[PDB]
Amino acid sequence: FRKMAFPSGKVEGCMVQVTCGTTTLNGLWLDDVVYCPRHVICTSEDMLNPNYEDLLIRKSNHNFLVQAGNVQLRVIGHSMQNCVLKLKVDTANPKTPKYKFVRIQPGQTFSVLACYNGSPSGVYQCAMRPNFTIKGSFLNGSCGSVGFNIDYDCVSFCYMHHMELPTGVHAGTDLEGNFYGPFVDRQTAQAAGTDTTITVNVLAWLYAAVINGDRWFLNRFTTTLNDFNLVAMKYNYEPLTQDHVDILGPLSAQTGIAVLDMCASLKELLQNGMNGRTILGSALLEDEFTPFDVVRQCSG
Amino acid sequence: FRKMAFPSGKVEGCMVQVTCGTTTLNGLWLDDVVYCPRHVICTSEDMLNPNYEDLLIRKSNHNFLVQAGNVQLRVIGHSMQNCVLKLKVDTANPKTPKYKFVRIQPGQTFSVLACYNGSPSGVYQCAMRPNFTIKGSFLNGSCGSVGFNIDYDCVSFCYMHHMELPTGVHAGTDLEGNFYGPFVDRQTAQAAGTDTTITVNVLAWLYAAVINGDRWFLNRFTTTLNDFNLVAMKYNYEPLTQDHVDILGPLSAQTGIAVLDMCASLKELLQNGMNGRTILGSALLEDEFTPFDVVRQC
Numbered sequence: 001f002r003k004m005a006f007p008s009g010k011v012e013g014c015m016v017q018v019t020c021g022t023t024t025l026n027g028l029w030l031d032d033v034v035y036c037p038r039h040v041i042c043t044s045e046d047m048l049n050p051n052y053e054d055l056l057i058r059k060s061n062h063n064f065l066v067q068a069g070n071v072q073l074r075v076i077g078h079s080m081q082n083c084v085l086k087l088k089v090d091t092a093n094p095k096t097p098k099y100k101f102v103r104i105q106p107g108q109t110f111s112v113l114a115c116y117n118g119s120p121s122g123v124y125q126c127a128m129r130p131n132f133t134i135k136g137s138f139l140n141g142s143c144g145s146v147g148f149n150i151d152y153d154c155v156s157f158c159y160m161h162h163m164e165l166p167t168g169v170h171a172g173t174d175l176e177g178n179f180y181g182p183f184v185d186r187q188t189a190q191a192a193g194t195d196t197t198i199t200v201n202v203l204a205w206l207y208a209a210v211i212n213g214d215r216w217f218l219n220r221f222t223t224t225l226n227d228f229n230l231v232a233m234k235y236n237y238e239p240l241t242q243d244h245v246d247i248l249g250p251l252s253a254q255t256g257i258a259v260l261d262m263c264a265s266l267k268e269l270l271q272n273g274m275n276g277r278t279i280l281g282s283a284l285l286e287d288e289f290t291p292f293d294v295v296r297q298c299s300g
Numbered sequence: 301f302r303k304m305a306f307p308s309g310k311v312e313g314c315m316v317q318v319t320c321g322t323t324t325l326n327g328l329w330l331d332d333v334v335y336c337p338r339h340v341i342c343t344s345e346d347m348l349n350p351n352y353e354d355l356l357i358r359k360s361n362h363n364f365l366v367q368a369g370n371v372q373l374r375v376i377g378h379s380m381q382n383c384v385l386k387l388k389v390d391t392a393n394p395k396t397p398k399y400k401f402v403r404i405q406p407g408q409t410f411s412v413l414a415c416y417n418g419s420p421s422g423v424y425q426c427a428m429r430p431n432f433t434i435k436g437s438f439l440n441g442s443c444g445s446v447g448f449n450i451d452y453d454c455v456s457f458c459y460m461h462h463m464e465l466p467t468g469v470h471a472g473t474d475l476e477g478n479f480y481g482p483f484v485d486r487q488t489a490q491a492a493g494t495d496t497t498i499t500v501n502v503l504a505w506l507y508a509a510v511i512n513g514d515r516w517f518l519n520r521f522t523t524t525l526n527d528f529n530l531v532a533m534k535y536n537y538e539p540l541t542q543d544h545v546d547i548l549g550p551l552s553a554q555t556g557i558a559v560l561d562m563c564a565s566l567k568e569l570l571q572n573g574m575n576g577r578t579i580l581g582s583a584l585l586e587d588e589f590t591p592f593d594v595v596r597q598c
């Protein structure tokens with residue numbers, strides 16, 4: 001198994017650059033609106049505790065330089081929605097895909113199109129950690145790069161990049177501008193919650209192992225969801241939700257292994273360790289493949 | 301540190317579907333030519349010992365169905381170049397990027413756009429193994445998916461997918477239709493030569509781990525180039541050349557760790573192991589990042 005990103009072309013066709021003064025970051029051009037992080041209006045002096053509302057009142061449409069490549073897009077309105085700026089432009093993007101804005105849950109994966117100056121540089125798969133950070137590869141100038149999933153013709157945008165935390169992990173918002181996690185767009189001291197292991201994804205991984213014939217860890221027992229959750233927390237695993245149980249449905253049906261029976265197998269692995277054994281050729285349990293990722297690869 | 305693929309849009313706009321009889325795979329549509337694996341012209345009974353020139357002379361332009369989305373492209377000509385079929389169509393692709401065809405060297409990396417029925421499905425980074433296989437993720441119908449690198453505006457196509465081996469690794473050709481490795485496009489179980497580990501890439505990745513503040517594997521020892529290479533060969537690592545040392549200069553400068561010092565750290569890891577420890581998340585030494593890959597992402 002490997003991290004596989006979605007093809008990025010439908011998102012590449014939406015990337016632009018947005019500049020205020022000397023600050024350039026990326027924006028997302030859909031129909032006649034460009035979405036970008038509101039901290040584009042900050043000077044270095046405003047970043048420690050910006051008054052975004054006061055900073056925005058000082059701005060006019062003609063202060064925003066929006067470019068697709070070297071071609072300027074004229075701004076005809078502006079507004080702030082939580083931590084994102086929305087710039088109305090006079091041209092509808094002809095490459096606008098079918099799209100929606102979604103707010104994902106921890107554990108869910110998405111593709112990131114890393115961009116600098118409106119130009120895409122790379123694409124890679126990210127997992128939203130339970131502490132609402134991602135382990136991106138984001139340099140200066142990457143803000144406004146987005147994360148997405150593609151289903152049929154439809155791009156679901158779920159992430160827009162805003163900042164790096166002291167530990168090197170990354171934080172951002174959904175496309176309505178609401179941060180994931182307890183972070184704020186100020187250049188202040190912020191730390192992530194201690195991270196935990198994404199249980200639903202480990203279970204997906206165990207299902208993948210079973211599909212591929214590697215099933216030594218299956219046992220004759222079961223558990224309740226509550227009993228499993230109380231044990232899992234003692235090993236720094238996330239508790240399962242009802243939604244987690246539901247999204248394991250398809251893999252449970254494909255293997256005939258009830259979700260709670262797999263939980264009992266995982267509980268035994270946590271309590272007894274691997275005893276020098278491997279699963280899918282690894283003594284480490286993987287937690288960045290979702291149930292959908294596993295189906296995406298195993299079955300095509 | 302993240303494996304990062306090139307943005308795939310310039311290649312997505314070239315993918316089409318090619319069908320012959322009951323066989324469907326992907327093709328690459330550049331200007332007015334579609335490139336695809338020639339085994340699309342095979343049936344079940346053909347796959348075992350296909351005399352491709354014989355099978356092809358018995359085909360007409362009209363036996364080839366090419367679809368770009370919902371639109372059928374009329375084939376007005378065909379030819380074979382090694383293991384690739386070239387179908388001339390009456391329409392030019394306006395989305396054809398600036399491109400070239402290159403043959404890559406073992407140890408080099410590229411992005412794969414995996415496709416099914418002419419539709420892009422996923423993108424990921426691969427390395428050409430020293431034994432000329434690739435560790436891909438390819439399923440039924442993935443043939444004709446391509447691998448590529450992008451430099452500025454220019455797409456360098458280096459790989460077209462043809463087959464899976466019994467071990468689960470993959471084999472294919474350059475865009476001139478010559479296989480990488482000793483493989484043949486017949487429906488037989490084929491083994492590769494013994495694989496080895498790409499040493500210059502492991503060193504690049506260790507330098508990456510250091511840059512990201514991870515240096516538990518470092519040491520004060522050093523080694524000569526020849527003595528390192530003796531140990532490498534013993535562990536089925538590829539030789540490290542002076543060109544490789546030179547190529548690693550920038551990473552050496554940035555971290556202030558001489559290449560041969562990092563060679564001494566790798567030698568220790570080979571002889572002793574990781575003793576449970578991990579490097580950049582991995583229990584294993586990673587060898588599919590090139591020096592250029594590490595830099596580009598730093």
Ligand SMILES: *[C@@H](O)[C@H](C[C@@H]1CCNC1=O)NC(=O)[C@H](CC(C)C)NC(=O)OCC(C)(C)Oc1ccc(F)cc1
Binds near residue numbers: 347443444464466490
């Ligand atoms: C694309 O047409 C397809 C891609 C394969 C399918 C699954 N994963 C892939 O990468 N190519 C082939 O199926 C290829 C066609 C030949 C004409 C070159 N053959 C192939 O990949 O065979 C797979 C294999 C596992 C080797 O199956 C076996 C065939 C014969 C045997 F004796 C034993 C196994």
